[PDB]
């Protein structure tokens, strides 16, 4: 029924500016007081702004500074948050929140819209197979890989033979090297069954708009 | 600036263990709320008002506490309760750091697998070896490489999943990557876990000059 959802964010260079969007559905949006909570990368919450039902009465996190601006459009059900002289502590999920009483507990949040202050550029990661080949193995099960290095921003996503091998399927958190994201991804099958059944690693970077396919093959020693 | 602290940061229960975790203001304040977050969705609203439980929160868990000092309680734990709470109040510009609730289970030791460098990567001039170690518990385990007999320390990075939806194993990569040249001036390399399933590690182990 309630709906909360948010949209505008992106990468953006230090010193810059960004408006994000919250489109409300399934409640009388202008009977409710409104804000904003950001998560950044340590997963600390911090509130950033707050918004009176009227439009008439607002407040801000310590932090902010007087460099954002809340506001809201009653007609529309949306509601905004204008940054700018955006820094590197901003980075962060920032969360469209709604209030319920006037203790202001926060009773239905939004999906999150993702922003990222720094001057790094777009990037698509490498993707490399991942086969035994030296450290061959000899049990009932075979554990393959794949490696995806070199991308940015977050995320990527991970998927073997377009999601058919869902069990055994292990994809790890990515970390920043030399500035750039690299994550792994492993598989674990029957043994019997590879090489004669094919496996293949999806790797999908939406921020750059590719799509890679790797075949795991045995390697030519 | 009043200010919350949460305690403990981590702890752990098998499922049918009395919970209980903490949140400290730095001066009296009232109407304490309670945040419940789980990887990849948005924090939902559990406790409220102190004691009012939201909509959907099952009666085994309980809010209480006054002045400076509130608590959140759990009877009979769940699988299902594993999650981030965080402490909130009205007057406070950052939330408290929160607890996080993390399901004990029997000790398993780590299937590990090693990974030559891809002649791919090779090509463009890196050499990462991969090493898995999956399906292992407790979380803290050691991780050591040796490169033709002595051990190595600069250019490795170990990254954990969260506690395994289903088992509540966790699962982990140590990746040691290098220039192609580093690599081309080695032949043996090994991965080691030591956990406490065994004294004794496993090992993993490829001579670079072999295939
Ligand atoms: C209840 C309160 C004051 C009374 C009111 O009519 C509405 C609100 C909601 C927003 C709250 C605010 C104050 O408490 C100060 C807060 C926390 C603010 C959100 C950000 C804030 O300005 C701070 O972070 C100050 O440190």
């Known amino acids: 029924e309630v709906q909360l959802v948010e949209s505008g964010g992106g990468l953006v260079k230090p010193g810059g500016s960004l408006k994000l969007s919250c489109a409300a559905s399934?409640?009388?949006?202008?009977?409710?007081?409104m804000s904003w909570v950001r998560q950044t990368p340590e997963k600390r919450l911090e509130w950033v702004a707050f918004?009176?039902?009227?439009?008439?009465?607002?407040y801000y996190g310590d932090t902010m500074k007087g460099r954002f601006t809340i506001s809201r459009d009653n007609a529309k059900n949306t509601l905004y948050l204008q940054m700018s002289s955006l820094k590197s502590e901003d980075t962060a999920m920032y969360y469209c929140?709604?209030?319920?009483?006037?203790?202001?507990?926060?009773?239905?949040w939004g999906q999150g819209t993702s922003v990222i202050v720094s001057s790094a550029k777009t990037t698509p990661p490498s993707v490399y197979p991942l086969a035994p080949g030296s450290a061959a193995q000899t049990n009932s099960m075979v554990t393959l890989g794949c490696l995806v290095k070199g991308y940015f921003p977050e995320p990527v996503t991970v998927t073997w033979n377009s999601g058919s091998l869902s069990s055994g399927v292990h994809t790890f958190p990515a970390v920043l090297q030399s500035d750039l994201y690299t994550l792994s991804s492993s598989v674990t099958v029957p043994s019997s069954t590879w090489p004669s059944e094919t496996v293949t690693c999806n790797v999908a970077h939406p921020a750059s708009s590719t799509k890679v396919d790797k075949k795991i093959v045995p390697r030519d020693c | 600036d009043i200010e919350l602290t949460q305690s403990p940061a981590v702890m752990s229960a098998f499922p049918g263990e009395e919970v209980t975790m903490t949140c400290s203001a730095s001066?009296?304040?009232?109407?304490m709320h309670w945040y419940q977050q789980k990887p990849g969705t948005s924090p939902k609203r559990w406790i409220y008002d102190t004691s009012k439980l939201a909509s959907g929160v099952p009666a085994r868990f309980s809010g209480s506490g006054s002045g400076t000092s509130y608590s959140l309680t759990i009877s009979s734990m769940e699988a299902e309760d594993a999650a981030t709470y965080y402490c909130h109040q009205r007057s406070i510009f950052t939330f408290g750091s929160g607890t996080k609730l993390e399901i004990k289970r029997a000790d398993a030791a780590p299937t590990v697998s090693i990974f030559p460098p891809s002649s791919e990567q090779l090509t463009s001039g890196g050499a990462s070896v991969v090493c898995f170690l999956n399906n292992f518990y407790p979380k803290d385990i050691n991780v050591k490489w040796k490169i033709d007999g002595s051990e190595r320390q600069n250019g490795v990075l170990n990254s954990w999943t969260d506690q395994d939806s289903k088992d509540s194993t966790y699962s982990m990569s140590s990746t040691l990557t290098l220039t192609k040249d580093e690599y081309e001036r080695h032949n043996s390399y090994t991965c080691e876990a030591t956990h406490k399933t065994s004294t004794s590690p496993i090992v993993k182990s490829f001579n670079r000059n072999e295939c």
């Open positions: 399934g409640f009388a949006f202008g009977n409710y007081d």
């Open positions: 918004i009176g039902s009227g439009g008439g009465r607002i």
């Open positions: 929140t709604r209030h319920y009483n006037y203790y202001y507990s926060m009773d239905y």
């Open positions: 001066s009296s304040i009232n109407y």
